[PDB]
């Protein structure tokens, strides 16, 4: 069918640490999964946002994960 109740984006696990270098780059640490808002620029770096920040990120320090259900595992 059709889904019209999403409104958001996917995530992507930051495999290592890193920071924003370009004026439009994004920073993150090892384990800081970001929110892929888009995929502009090269086909190797994504576009995402960490709870407020955003910008390009080299996918080599990342992986693309789906939408998880809540974080509380206990």
């Amino acid at each position: 069918g059709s889904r019209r109740a999403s409104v958001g984006s996917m995530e992507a696990i930051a495999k290592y640490d890193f920071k924003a270098t370009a004026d439009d780059e994004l920073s993150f640490k090892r384990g800081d999964i970001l929110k892929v808002l888009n995929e502009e620029c090269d086909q190797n770096w994504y576009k995402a946002e960490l709870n407020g920040k955003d910008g390009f990120i080299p996918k080599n320090y990342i992986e693309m994960k789906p939408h998880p259900e809540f974080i509380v595992t206990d």
């Binding site: 290592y16 080299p58 320090y61």
Partner: peptide, 15 residues
């Protein structure tokens, strides 16, 4: 090429 470099654009190998 090795691991976590400056992310260079690949091209060819050593052979």
């Amino acid at each position: 090429s090795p691991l976590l470099p400056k992310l260079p654009p690949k091209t060819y190998k050593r052979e």
